[PDB]
Each structure stands twice: as structure tokens, then as C-alpha cells.
Design brief:
The chain is an alpha+beta fold. The protein has ten helices and nine strands. It folds into two domains: 90-280, Transferase(Phosphotransferase) domain 1 (Transferase(Phosphotransferase), domain 1, Orthogonal Bundle); 1-89 and 281-298, Phosphorylase Kinase, domain 1 (2-Layer Sandwich). This is cAMP-dependent protein kinase type 1.
């Protein structure tokens, strides 16, 4: 893969480390998104590691519902990340534009997220940053989990406290070692938000938030059907001996919850099912003097 192997079409957005672009392969006329990161910056911001670790993760994970990176490459001043081109937007803005989601819609999305989590987990890889913001929807309405900046290969336990305040689990707020089960806590919060419009322990200020998370009652809105109320009740628990996903049968207990009875995990996993919504219709790359950073962006 090379910069001449494609033809830039337009800027899709402006990241902190640089733009990203809409590109067409000039070999098969396929589309991708070029995420460009200026090395000069990545390092000014002491963000080298975080950047390489994402590339690795993306190199060792393949799933219908996990975004794909077909490759990288770099010139003398920035790295390039060729990635799936997702048409459809982010589950977050879809949510806000419609206050709350209804049981089945939420159920669908949860089901696909469950599947990718099942995968990641079966390889001792935990995600760690489950928000509606990192879930993108592609043209046909399916899901694509993005940003694997916080995913780590965790065979036993880990420590690093990261993620997003509301969707975070207790054992992380209070610096304890944790396995992949935090992912199930966050999963429960994603579901609560798709159905309520808000997170359960929200609070404009951070610590006030780590507070409730740590010491607050889980109260459900009335229209919540029992099932969801039960699932969320098992998912969003503070005691890991009872939290779904961390039990004798791992993912199976989540996949087998009543709330997911009419779900053929097999049909869904093949994208051979129907979707509840289909989304609708300087810059000097190539330069190459000396690169003081090469030593750090070698795998690219």
C-alpha cells in the first residue's frame, strides 16, 4: 500500500493529530478512510505508545462488528492508517437525535456489541472504552466498534485506570486489579443509556461521578421491562461474584439471558438478518526529508 495507490477525495474530519480523508483505491475503486497523524505532534503530546498499541490491536483482531485496518505506511512526517469507510454516523448522535431507544433497537445493538465483546474476550483482550460514541453504524445498519486505543491483552489482571467516567466500573475507580469483566459493567451502562437517555450515575462534575459509581443506588425508569431490569441488575453489580459475564460460563450467561431469547446469535453474526435502521446517502503528504522519529514509528 502506497500514497499513490489511492486518490484522496475529501476531508471527513479534523483529529487532534491531523485530518482523515475519504479515499478511493485506484486499483479496484474501493473506499477507505485515511487517518493521518503528524509524528511531530504525536510525540510533542507524549502519545507514541498509545498510537503503536492501537495499530497492533487492529492488526490482530478481525470481526464483522470490529472496524478493520487494511494497512499503514508513512512518509517523512506523518503516518497513514487505511481503514474501513463507515457511512452511517455514531450511535451517540443517533441517540441524542432520538432521545431514547426502544427495547428492541437497544436489544439489537446490544446483541451485536455482545458478539464482538465475546470475540475480544475469547482472546483475553478487553476493550475498556465502551461508549455510544465509539460505536459506528454502516450503511446497512450494522455495528462497527471503533477506537481500540485502550484495549489490552489481559490474561489475568491489570491496573491502568482509563475510560470514560460514567461508563467506568467501580473496581477501576478504586484502583483494584481487574479482568475483562469491567467490559460487562460498561456494557450494562451502554444499555441503560440507550433506554433512558442518560447514564445511571451521571453528574456534571467528575468526582461527584466517581462517587455515585462507587456509592449509589441503581434506580430504573418505569418503562423498563423486567428483563432489562434484571439483566442490568446483574450486569451493573459491584460484586464480581454475581456480575454476568464473569461467571462459570463466561459470555454464555449474557448471551443466554432472557432479554436475548429471540436472538439467533448465528444469523446476526453473519449479517444475514434485518436491521432496525439503515443510515442514508498544510497537506503535503509524501514529503520525505529526514525523520527524527522513524526510530519510533517503525511498525507503520
Amino acid at each position: 500500500y502506497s500514497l499513490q495507490d489511492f486518490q484522496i477525495l475529501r476531508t471527513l474530519g479534523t483529529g487532534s493529530f491531523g485530518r482523515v480523508h475519504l479515499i478511493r483505491s485506484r486499483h479496484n475503486g474501493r473506499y477507505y478512510a485515511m487517518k493521518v497523524l503528524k509524528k511531530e505532534i504525536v510525540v510533542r503530546l507524549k502519545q507514541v505508545e498509545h498510537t503503536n498499541d492501537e495499530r497492533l490491536m487492529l492488526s490482530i483482531v478481525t470481526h464483522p462488528f470490529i472496524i478493520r485496518m487494511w494497512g499503514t505506511f508513512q512518509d517523512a512526517q506523518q503516518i497513514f492508517m487505511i481503514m474501513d469507510y463507515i457511512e452511517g454516523g455514531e450511535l451517540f448522535s443517533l441517540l441524542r437525535k432520538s432521545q431514547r431507544f426502544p427495547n428492541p433497537v437497544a436489544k439489537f445493538y446490544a446483541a451485536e456489541v455482545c458478539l464482538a465483546l465475546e470475540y475480544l474476550h475469547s482472546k483475553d483482550i478487553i476493550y475498556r472504552d465502551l461508549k455510544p460514541e465509539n460505536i459506528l453504524l454502516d450503511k446497512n445498519g450494522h455495528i462497527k466498534i471503533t477506537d481500540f486505543g485502550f484495549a489490552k491483552y489481559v490474561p489475568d489482571v491489570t491496573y491502568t485506570l482509563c475510560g470514560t467516567p460514567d461508563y467506568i466500573a467501580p473496581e477501576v475507580v478504586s484502583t483494584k486489579p481487574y479482568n475483562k469483566s469491567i467490559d460487562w459493567w460498561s456494557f450494562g451502562i451502554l444499555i441503560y443509556e440507550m433506554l433512558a437517555g442518560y447514564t445511571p450515575f451521571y453528574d456534571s462534575n467528575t468526582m461527584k461521578t466517581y462517587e455515585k459509581i462507587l456509592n449509589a443506588e441503581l434506580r430504573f425508569p418505569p418503562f423498563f421491562n423486567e428483563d432489562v431490569k434484571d439483566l442490568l441488575s446483574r450486569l451493573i453489580t459491584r460484586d464480581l461474584s454475581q456480575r454476568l459475564g464473569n461467571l462459570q460460563n463466561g459470555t454464555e450467561d449474557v448471551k443466554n439471558h432472557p432479554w436475548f431469547k429471540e436472538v439467533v446469535w448465528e444469523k446476526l453474526l453473519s449479517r444475514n438478518i434485518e436491521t432496525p435502521y439503515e443510515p442514508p446517502i498544510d497537506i503535503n503528504y509524501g514529503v520525505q526529508g529526514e525523520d527524527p522519529y522513524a526510530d519510533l514509528f517503525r511498525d507503520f
